[PDB]
Structure formats: structure tokens, C-alpha cells
């Protein structure tokens, strides 16, 4: 297959404005949300139909209980961090865990935490240790590393359980996740040449401009890959035209194993 990933995020907010949840957790497969939970609903709900259709109620009920427990733990952890930073007001705590099954069959696994949107603790599952960014993280790192079994548990979950969940969800949503919608590509004039792709799935795409055959990395302006709203994506890349010498410019697009070239005559 192509490369696929499974990730779970958590957001916690210490003093949220009225209405905004104290806690949120969302799962993703590649760019697709699959599941969601927050402190206002107190329920785990599917965010993809093929999750809803393949997981019995006993599954949603079980992780609803687990999530309510994780919410309280997250609150406790945020409380301790903001005491140790000696910080007033509202602050955020985030977590991300997940794994990747690469096309070559190899795997990766990650777990990390952030405070106020900045790296805080990063797990290394090969050295079984935590990287701390400052001395508040270092205090937390000492306590987490004293419990060697919990580290071993995370290694097992990242290398074996997460990969097995990913394969199970990849099968559930295969009509979505494993399909290919080729890009529609054109060149417009605006002075600069704009190479525009749209209508493509998956979102991973490489677009670049060549000049006479050689690439021109420092001269290219790359736009972002953007959701169209219908399950496909669009992107662009521009290059600034030289008015004093003619050059052969060509746009190069690579998507899902297929390369395209649009020569600008």
C-alpha cells in the first residue's frame, strides 16, 4: 500500500472561556478524523461513517469510559505543570500518540506532549527514555522514567497494538483511504506562471517548476495542499518569469506513483 498513519491527539485547557471544552481527544487515520470525545458530551463518537458501521456499541461504550478517565488524568497533569511553571490564567496541554505503516512494510511510532503549543516531552521508544525541553519537563521525566514498566508498555503499544489498530481501520475504510483520484493540472499566467492541481486524493502531492531541465528550489513559491470540501484536495506552485531571456519552463507533478509534465510553450 501507500504509507498510512494512525494518531490520537488530546487538548486540555486550564481555564476555558464559557462553552469551550476543558478536554478534547480526536483520532485520525491519515488526514481523516475517525473518532472524537470531549468533556462536554462525555461520549466517544465516530467521525467517519466506516468507523460507525464496523464497530459495535460495546466498543464505543468501553472507550467512552476510558476517555472519561483520561480526561481526569489530563486535568491533573495540566494542573501540576502550571503549578510548576508558576503560571496564571489559561494554558494548554497537548498529547499526540500514534504510528505509521510505511509502504516498504517498515513501521514508526511516536508519543509526545506539548505545553502552550510547544514541545514539552518526547518519547524515544528505542532508548526507552523521555526528552525534556526544560526543567519542569525534567521533573516529569524523572518520575515517568522511574516506572520502567510503563515505558515498556508504551513501546509495545506503539510497535504492535497501534500498527494492528491501523491495519484494522485501513480495512474498514479502504474504499476511502486506498483509492486514487488523479489531479487535474493546468498552467495559468498572472508576472508569474502558476501551476494548479485540483480534484486529487490522497493529499500527498509533489509539484515543482523546472527551468531548462534543472530545478530552481530557491525561486519557487509553494502553496499549501488544501481541502476542497468534497474529499479531494488542491494545490499550486508559482515561478517568477524572467523578461530578459527566454527559458523553457515546465511544471512537474507527482502523485500516487505517476509523474506529469506540463511544458509552457
Amino acid at each position: 500500500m501507500r504509507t498510512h498513519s494512525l494518531r490520537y491527539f488530546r487538548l486540555g485547557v486550564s481555564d476555558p472561556i464559557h462553552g469551550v471544552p476543558e478536554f478534547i481527544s480526536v483520532g485520525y487515520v491519515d488526514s481523516h478524523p475517525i473518532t472524537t470525545y470531549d468533556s462536554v458530551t462525555r461520549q466517544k463518537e465516530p467521525r467517519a461513517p466506516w468507523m460507525a458501521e464496523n464497530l459495535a456499541p460495546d466498543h464505543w461504550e468501553r472507550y467512552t469510559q476510558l476517555l472519561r478517565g483520561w480526561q481526569q488524568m489530563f486535568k491533573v497533569e495540566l494542573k501540576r505543570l502550571q503549578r510548576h511553571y508558576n503560571h496564571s490564567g489559561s494554558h494548554t496541554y497537548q498529547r499526540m500518540i500514534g504510528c505509521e505503516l510505511l509502504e516498504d512494510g517498515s513501521t514508526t511510532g511516536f508519543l509526545q506532549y506539548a505545553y502552550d503549543g510547544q514541545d514539552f516531552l518526547i518519547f524515544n521508544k528505542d532508548t526507552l527514555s523521555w526528552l525534556a525541553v526544560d526543567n519542569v519537563a525534567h521533573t516529569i521525566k524523572q518520575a515517568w522514567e522511574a516506572n520502567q514498566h510503563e515505558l515498556l508498555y508504551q513501546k509495545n503499544w506503539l510497535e504492535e497494538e497501534c500498527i494492528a489498530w491501523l491495519k484494522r481501520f485501513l480495512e474498514y475504510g479502504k474504499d476511502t483511504l486506498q483509492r486514487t483520484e488523479p489531479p487535474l493540472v493546468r498552467v495559468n499566467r498572472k508576472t508569474a506562471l502558476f501551476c494548479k492541481a485540483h480534484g486529487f486524493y490522497p493529499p500527498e502531492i509533489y509539484m515543482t517548476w523546472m527551468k531548462n531541465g534543472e530545478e530552481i528550489v530557491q525561486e519557487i513559491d509553494y502553496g499549501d495542499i488544501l481541502p476542497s470540501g468534497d474529499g479531494t484536495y488542491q494545490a499550486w506552485a508559482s515561478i517568477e518569469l524572467d523578461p530578459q531571456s527566454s527559458n523553457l519552463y515546465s511544471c512537474h507533478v507527482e502523485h500516487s506513483g505517476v509523474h506529469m509534465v506540463l511544458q509552457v510553450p
Epitope: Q65, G69, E161
Partner: antibody, heavy 108, light 116 residues
Framework: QNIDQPTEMTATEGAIVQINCTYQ??????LFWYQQHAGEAPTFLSY??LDGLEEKGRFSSFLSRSKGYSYLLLKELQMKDSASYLC??????????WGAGTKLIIKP | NAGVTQTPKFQVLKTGQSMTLQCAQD?????MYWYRQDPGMGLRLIYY???????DKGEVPNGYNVSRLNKREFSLRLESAAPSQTSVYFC??????????????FGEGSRLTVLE
């Protein structure tokens, strides 16, 4: 899902006994051993989640994830080791499945 | 420093009678559990409480109910005792749940015999 251990084992004081635990589960988040003296509460002995052997005094615990089996190894057996030994496995949803327990009888 | 305290140690009941088993833990744990233990089989979860303010059924919930009264206490109610609820009941607690590493701490056990 199921977990299996022998009903009962008998060894002699001073010897070595290996108590087996095989499990069939969807997903695996760890294997626990607990000691339960007759009429008393189970208490935590050991936890394995990666492959291999971990020692803890006279007791060692072994795990092979690919075989789905673990053993609890008790050396230099004493009469106070007479007890039930309970194996328990955390499945993919962090739910414990308990073996029925092995009663260890020690001959003085 | 008490650990898990559950009561009563022994109880006899007539079929149809009600009973509440008490459990408290002074360890500041978040997760609490009620098990039954019977000859020839592994511990079976009756109900559990992953955290204060939430509870849910286990493997064998029928004929029982629970109340997570606060962080410390988790009571098991038998509302209409039946002879099949003759068993030894164990309350347990753990620091958290949905962590893989944390062990359970068990109470002393409650021995219940239900008679016609």
C-alpha cells in the same frame, strides 16, 4: 479470548517450579502474575509486556508474545510459597482476562 | 495506609434479601472494581468505575448495581439475592486505568452464601 494455566502443581521444598500460562487474545497490553494465599486477597507479583525474562528475588517471570505464553519461575521453594498463582492478560481494550489459577502444593 | 477496606467479611442471605457491600480505598486511586471469584474459573468483573463520576458494567452485571459515591468509595448492591450469587466478592483499585502497566490492589474479600 481465553487464558489457560494448570489447575494444580506439587513440588518439593527447596526445588524449582515453573508455572505456565498460555493465552489467546485479540491484542496484548501486558501479562500479570498475582499471588493468592488461601482465604486471602491476591497481590501483585510481576508484569511483563516485552519478550524475555525478568527476575525479582526468588521469582522470575518470562514472556513470549509470539508464542502467547508466560511462566512464573519459583526457585528454592519454601512452605510459605504454598498458594494459588493467578495469571492475567490485558487485551487490546485494556480489559483483564484472568486465568483460573494454579494451586502450588509444597512437600516439606 | 489501610489500602482497600471492604465489608462485611462474611454474610448469609435468604433468597430475595438485599445486601450492600462496602469498599473504600485510602490510596487516592481513580479506578475501582468489583469482582466475584468462584471455584474452577478466573475472576469475573461485575462492575467497574474508571474514574470518579463514571461507572459501567463488567462481564457479569446482572443482579448487581454499583455506586461510585466519591473518589474513595465504591459499593456493590445485590438487590434480590439469588443462590447463584453465592461467591467470594473482591473489591480492587488501581491508580488509573487504560494504562497497561498498573497493578490492582485488592480488598480482603467478602464471602456471601445465599440460601433458599
Amino acid at each position: 479470548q481465553n487464558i489457560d494455566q494448570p489447575t494444580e502443581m506439587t513440588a518439593t521444598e527447596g526445588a524449582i517450579v515453573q508455572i505456565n500460562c498460555t493465552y489467546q487474545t485479540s491484542g496484548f497490553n501486558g501479562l500479570f502474575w498475582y499471588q493468592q494465599h488461601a482465604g486471602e486477597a491476591p497481590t501483585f507479583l510481576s508484569y511483563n509486556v516485552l519478550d524475555g525474562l525478568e527476575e525479582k528475588g526468588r521469582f522470575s517471570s518470562f514472556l513470549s508474545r509470539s508464542k502467547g505464553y508466560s511462566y512464573l519461575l519459583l526457585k528454592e521453594l519454601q512452605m510459605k510459597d504454598s498458594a494459588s498463582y493467578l495469571c492475567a492478560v490485558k487485551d487490546s481494550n485494556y480489559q483483564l482476562i484472568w486465568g483460573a489459577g494454579t494451586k502450588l502444593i509444597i512437600k516439606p | 495506609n489501610a489500602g482497600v477496606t471492604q465489608t462485611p467479611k462474611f454474610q448469609v442471605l435468604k433468597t430475595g434479601q438485599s445486601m450492600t457491600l462496602q469498599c473504600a480505598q485510602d490510596m487516592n486511586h481513580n479506578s475501582m472494581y468489583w469482582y466475584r471469584q468462584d471455584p474452577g474459573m478466573g475472576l469475573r468483573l461485575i462492575y467497574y468505575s474508571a474514574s470518579e463520576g463514571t461507572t459501567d458494567k463488567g462481564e457479569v452485571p446482572n443482579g448487581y448495581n454499583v455506586s461510585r459515591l466519591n473518589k474513595r468509595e465504591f459499593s456493590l448492591r445485590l438487590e434480590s439475592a439469588a443462590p447463584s450469587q453465592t461467591s467470594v466478592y473482591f473489591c480492587a483499585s488501581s491508580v488509573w486505568t487504560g494504562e497497561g502497566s498498573g497493578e490492582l490492589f485488592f480488598g480482603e474479600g467478602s464471602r456471601l452464601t445465599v440460601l433458599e
